[PDB]
Amino acid sequence: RYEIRWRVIESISPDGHEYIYVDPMQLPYDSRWEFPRDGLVLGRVLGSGAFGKVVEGTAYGLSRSQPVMKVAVKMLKPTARSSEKQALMSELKIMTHLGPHLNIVNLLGACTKSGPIYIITEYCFYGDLVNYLHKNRDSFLSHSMLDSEVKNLLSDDNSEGLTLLDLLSFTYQVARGMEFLASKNCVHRDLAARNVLLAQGKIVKICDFGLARDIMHDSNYVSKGSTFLPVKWMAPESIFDNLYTTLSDVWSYGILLWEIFSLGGTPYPGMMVDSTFYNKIKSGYRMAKPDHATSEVYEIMVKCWNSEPEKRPSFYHLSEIVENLLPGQYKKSYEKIHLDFLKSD
């Protein structure tokens, strides 16, 4: 029972109370992704889950830009239920269908022929945002101008105490990653700081890292109908009407920003998901401003949490809003890094 959460919308009825998602099994596997298994050496486990694991690795000759390249490798357990094996190929097909973006964990290649299915993806040095914000909590100082040279350092591996600028950078980058997925009509459905990784250069990449987690040991998921749901991140219409769209992704984005600007805090602190939680959300309960959010940032969270989905801002517009909260130089740096990424290989 392992499947990627992400869905791509193929059509909507004219009303439209009916979404049709692509069946990923119906998509093609471009065999040009295939990479020789002997070009790949596996190393330390990054995370292990109920159905498989993600492992650190080195790929030789996979990339022209980096002939010796650190990667992350997604794989199933040997027990390998067959439907699961298809699920993994489906994830592969979806990633090929979406194409690449700076701010997602990108597909780099696959081993699908003789042996267990491997998906080869970008490796993210700093791991997920939750743990990263935790580890750097004590070092956080608040203090936003290009002249300082603080702005130049942000999108680099240089070492300094965590700052509001960093938090805004993470915010901007998740918005650009989600603007990309939204432009492909891809609905994430599990957007949360745990599904945001941080890579070399402090580049945030959105992913689904569920394969590396045991859902049954994860308190952030609540059982429903034989499934477990990230309830504290879910829009009301997903909770009550089972409706998942880009607009419910925007709701999750607001929850994610709360995670960010509370330095890795758990949403709805001290509030367990139970009958009185659902009633409160339904009745319009929203979180108060986290300690390190500016007023402009909390205003963004509040907008994402509109009870009326169509009144929530688009990820394109969120990107613009956050861009104006950042120094002009930062957008300049991002553009250069965007271009370098696209030129890679």
Do 174 and 319 lie in a common domain? yes
Is 235 in the same domain as 146?
Answer: yes
Binding residues for ATP: 46-54, 74
Q: From CA 139, how far away is CA 150, in angstroms rounded?
A: 16
Looking at the structure, tell me whether residues 148 and 280 fall in a common domain. yes
Q: Which residues are tagged catalytic?
A: 190
- Whether residues 8 and 19 share a domain: the answer is yes
* Alpha-carbon torsion angle 32, 37, 39, 41, nearest 10: 140
Hey, how many other C-beta atoms are within 10 angstroms of the C-beta on 293? Answer: 20
Preceding amide of 16 cis, omega within 30: yes
> Going by DSSP bridges, is the β-strand pair 222-224/203-206 parallel, antiparallel, or unpaired?
unpaired
Cβ-based neighbours of 227, under 8 Å, separated by 6 or more: none
Q: Which DSSP state fits 295?
A: H
Is residue 29 in some structural domain?
yes
The answer to whether residue 56 sits within a structural domain is yes
Is the domain of 190 the same as that of 256?
A: yes
On whether the CB atoms of residues 107 and 95 are closer than 8 A, the answer is yes
Task: Please tell me whether residues 159 and 306 are part of one structural domain.
Answer: yes
CATH of the domain at 33: 3.30.200.20
Regarding whether 229 and 272 lie in a shared domain, the answer is: yes
> Which H/E stretch holds residue 119?
strand 118-122
User: Is 342 a domain residue?
Assistant: no
* CA 23 and chain centroid, separation: 22
Q: What's the per-residue H, E or C state across 61-90?
A: CCCCCCCEEEEEEEEECCCCCHHHHHHHHH
* Final residue of a structural domain among 123, 143, 160: 123
Tokens 């992913």 belong to residue? 207
The residues near 262 (Cβ < 8 Å, ≥ 6 apart) are: 290, 291, 292, 293
CA angle 100, 104, 106 (to 5 degrees): 50
- Are 302 and 286 spatial neighbours (Cβ–Cβ below 8 Å)? yes
Phi, psi of 252 (to 5 degrees): -55, -40
| 127 torsion bin: left (phi>0), alpha (psi -120 to 50), beta (else) | left
Determine the Cα–Cα distance for residues 132 and 198; give it in Å rounded to an integer: 8
Closest CA to 53 of 15, 30, 20, 84: 84
Instruction: Name 209's Cβ contacts closer than 8 Å, sequence gap at least 6.
Output: 47, 54, 128, 194, 195, 197
CATH of the domain at 229: 1.10.510.10
Residues 40 and 173 in one domain: no
Query: Is 337 part of any domain?
Result: no
Resolution in A: 2.2
Same domain, 119 and 129: no
Residue 221: closest CA among 207, 231, 213: 231
- Counting the structural domains of the chain, the total is 2
93/145 same-domain check: no
Domain assignment of residue 34, given as a range = 1-123
The verdict on 146 and 218 lying in the same domain is: yes
